[PDB]
Structures are given as C-alpha cells and as structure tokens.
C-alpha cells in the first residue's frame, strides 16, 4: 500500500542530452515523468515584443513568434524568478522578467544575417543559448540593405503547457520492455521487426518469451534539451516540479477534508 | 475568436476549488475527487498508486472532457477504510516515490560526472 | 500634423498637407506609402 | 519564408543549421551525409532542413520601402 | 493560428477539418520520442482506395532518412512499394512504415502498431 523504491542508472550524460533508466517505478509515475519534461518544466522564454522599428520582409508578428521559440539559458534563474502571476509589481520587474534589447541595421551590401547573437539581455545569466560560451547562432531574420529591425523583448517563466516555446526538450525518448515480453504490442510478424538499442535477444529471437505476470519495470529515457536547461537539470526540475504538484494537492485536499 | 488562454489548462478560476469531494451513494465507501486544472500527469499517478493499496476496491480517473481542465477520480475502499485517507495516503506515497527518486538522480549524476 | 510620406519609386521622405494632389517632389511618382506609426503595439510571442 | 526556429515535431533547434547545411552542400556533401553533420537524426529534424524552401532571399530581391 | 475548424488535406484528396488539439505530451510517441504533427483515422483510406497516401507516407520515411526527394512520378518501375519497403528497412525501421507508438495519457504501449511517416498536408 505503500511507495515504490525506484532506482536510477544514467548511462550517458553529455551537455546535449541524458540517457538513463528508472527501475522499480509504476508506468503510471515513469509516464508523467515523462510528460513533465515536456510540459510542466519551467524555462525563460520571449513572451513579449515591442517592435519599434521593423523593415525587413517578415511582418511584426513572424518576428514576435521567431523570438519566442529562441531557446534562452534557464539555469539557475529559472528557480528565482516569480511567475507575472505572482509578482506584486506592475507589468515587469527585474524579479518575474528578463529584458532584451534588438536593434540592426543594414547598412553593407552584403545581406545582414540577424541572429539571436543580436539579442542583448540586461541580465548576464539569461541570454541565447547559441550566444553562450561550433554551432551557430539561430536566425531572426535576413535583412537587405536599407532594412532596419529595432526591437525590445522581455522574457518570462512558464512551462510547456501553455506554449511549446516554454518546452525544454528537443525530443523525450522513452521506451519499456524492449522485448515485447508483457505482450503490451503484438507483432503480426514479430521477425518483421527491428531491434530496440535497449534489446538483449539474440539475433534468431525476435521477442522475448510472453511473461505473465510481468509489469512495465525498467523505462529507458533519452531526454535530449534545446538548450535553456541541461537535461539533467531538466530531469531534477521534472521531479521537483511534479512532487510539488502533489505538495499543493495534498494541502487543497487537506482543507478539503477538514471543511467537511 | 474562440481560443481559450493557455493558462486556462493550469490556473485556477477565482472561486474554483482546486479539488472537491463527493461521497458516491450507488456503493458505500466511495468518493468522487473532482480535481480541477489537472489532467493525465496526475491523474495517472494517483490512480496506479491507488490500485497499489489492497484497501481499495476501487481506483479510476478520466477526463471528462479534453477541452475542459479537469479531472475525475473515483475511489472506492474497503468499508475499514476511506476515500479520502486512501487518496491522502496514495499522494503521501507518490510524494516519498519521488523524493526518493529525486535523490537517487541527484547521486546518480554525481556519480557520472566525476566517475 | 505633417503626415508625411514615403516615395513608392524613390523611398523619400516628404510632407503633403491635405488637398494636395499625391505628387513625390523628387521624382513625381504618383503613389505614396504612410510610414509606421509610433503607437505601442505589443505582440505575444506565441 | 525562413527556416524554422524550432523543429514542429520534437522542438529541436533547426534555425542555426540552416546556413551550415548550405555550406556543407556546397562542400560537395550529400543531403544525407550533411543532415548527418549537423546532427539531425530523428527523420523529423531531417524533413525541416530538407524541406526548406528559402524565399526569404526571393523577398530580398526587391528593394525595400525606405532608403 | 491553426485551430479546431481548419480544413486541411494531402495530395490524394484525404480533406478533413481539425478536430482537436493535443499537445506533445498529450499525442502518441514513438520510442524515440517522435509525436506525430497531424493524426487522421484510419477509416478515410478504405472507402477512397487512396494507397498513393501510403505510398507517398513510407517514400517521405525513406526521403527524410536518407536526405533526398522521393520520386513520386506517377509511371515509374523503377519505384513499387517493394523497393521502397526494402529501402525503409535499411535505416531501422520496419519496412511497411508501422511503429510501436505509445499512449500519450498512460505511456503504454499501442496494442496495433501505427503507420505513420512523413506527408505532405495543405492548409486550405
Ligand atoms: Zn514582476
Ligand atoms: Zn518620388
Ligand atoms: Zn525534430
């Protein structure tokens, strides 16, 4: 009646993703895990433009949107800000937001390549993950000679349920019971199939043989990040941020509870 | 013209219980847990470690409705028992689950680090 | 009050006051474009 | 008009690959071996930089509306 | 912004409107981590006998792992679905497009396994 033991075993840990494995946990836990990496994860993002100068041949919106979607280092200030929600100042503060400031122009002949390089922050720790300290750095808009872009951002606290932008990962691989032993898939031609990397068959086999009283134990993961946070980081903030879901039901439930 | 906020998936309603109970009267020993601005992520949960409990009879969850943002869980125990304690205790164990699974990430990232 | 214009065919800057036939003093071209506005726009970036 | 930020599929960065994958190309890699350069593995990511159509550089053809 | 009223279609006269919209987490995924940017019933293929869908599926799998444009011409044979299968099988995937997917809500695995592959769809 009571919590499961999980054990934990990463098998690769690199700046880019992290592979490892959760054993001794239901599926139910391993898949919202899973789902929190992707959508309750919080991270800095561009939720706000002003354009105040925009020549180029995408309209203001298409730069809004395209700032948006620029990963941005969430690292350690993610934590520390508040929510706008949260925050008992007016539309901005230093506390809840970031600013960032935008402004080329196209004076050379050659086509301007703004880059989220041209994304200035007045905070150190928030800035471009391509401008941290190889790849290159992702491109606002191409701009012609003549055309000018002149914009003032500001970033926000949020998570991927409500904006994909705010979602940390750059694809969630999960997988369990990479030989088909619990039966959960039925092949019509198991020998069709190929082999999970996670697999331990011999090659003549094409599944394990059907367990009975087996249960999904034992779900690989392969959390690869944009950027904004590092994947294990992304992985501590998913079970924080999913143990405080729980915190904050237990409390509501708790005054339910005493209410009646 | 028809697009809810995002944040209507997550934030609460001024005046909406996060959760409600109400004692189900087809059988006895059963609530229904209408938990409001949550979806599958705990739903899911809640219920497997429900089922884990030998005092529940009962253990089930569903979104009524995908474009609405709340949840649905039933819960059905042993007359020795109750819903609520059983709900109560099934958070309890999801909440140490994770600690405990929180600290094992914690040293087991130390570890690959150094060695 | 100026409303000044934009040249469609010599991109230049100059004022027309109201009952005035839409004429570019540079180059005569006939169709004129309003520059952007100073007014506060905000975008969501979503 | 422009590449993509983001993949549609996974939300992985495209954005930055888009100018590397054109200088690969024109190193005489195929799309394969550059889509395999940069690190596009999942047939998702593949698709956003092979798809790509750069009008972007079509609408640059044409002078802007100020000097 | 796209939304629940939008029509949209292939190239083999498979229109339908948006029903719904779910996010990443929410859609079914792939043991690498793939979810599909649009999900259409399987029921619109019998009927319509529109296998250029399918065909044009598992060559856009074949394209998008290979990095080149599949030849879709219509009389070809230098291209059947055979050469394409075997194509497909080469970069480990099974050769008729199908992959275990997995229950976006619960993380179980899809009893059926699911065809699915790269398209191209029209915004009407
Ligand atoms: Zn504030
Ligand atoms: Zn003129
Ligand atoms: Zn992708």
Redesign the interface.
Known sequence: ??????????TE?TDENVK?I?EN?????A???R??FI??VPIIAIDWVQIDANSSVLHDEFIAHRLGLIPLTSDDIVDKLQYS?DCTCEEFCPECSVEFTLDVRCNEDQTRHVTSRDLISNSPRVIPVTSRNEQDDILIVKLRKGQELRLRAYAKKGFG???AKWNPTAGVAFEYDPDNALRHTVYPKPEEWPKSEYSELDEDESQAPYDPNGKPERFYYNVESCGSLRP?TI??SA??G??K??????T???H??QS? | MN?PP??E???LFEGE?????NKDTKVPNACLFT?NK?????G??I???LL????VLFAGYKVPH??EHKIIIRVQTTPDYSP?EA???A????????????E??????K???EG | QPMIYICGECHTENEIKSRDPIRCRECGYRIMYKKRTKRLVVFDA? | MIIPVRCFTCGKIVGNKWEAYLGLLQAEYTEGDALDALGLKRYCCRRMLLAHVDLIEKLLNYAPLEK | ?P?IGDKFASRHGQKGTCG?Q?RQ??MPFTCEGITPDIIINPHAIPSRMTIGHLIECLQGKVSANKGEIGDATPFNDAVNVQKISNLLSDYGYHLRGNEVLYNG???RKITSQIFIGPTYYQRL
């Not at chain 1, 879901?245 to 237990?250: C, P």
């Not at chain 2, 949550?38 to 705990?42: G, I, K």
């Open positions: 009646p009571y919590a499961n033991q999980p054990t934990v075993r990463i840990l490892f959760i946990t239901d599926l139910a836990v898949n919202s895990i789902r929190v959508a309750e929600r349920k409500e904006h294990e992985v501590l079970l924080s999913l143990k879901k729980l915190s904050d039901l237990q509501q439930l708790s339910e509870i009646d | 697009a995002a944040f998936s997550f934030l219980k996060k959760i409600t109970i938990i949550e979806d599958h992520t705990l899911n949960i219920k497997s470690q884990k409990d030998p005092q995908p474009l609520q709900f109560t205790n958070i309890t164990d999801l909440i140490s689950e994770l600690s405990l699974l929180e094992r990430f914690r040293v087991a990232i570890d690959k680090q | 979503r | 912004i939304q719904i779910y987490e929410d809500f619960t993380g």
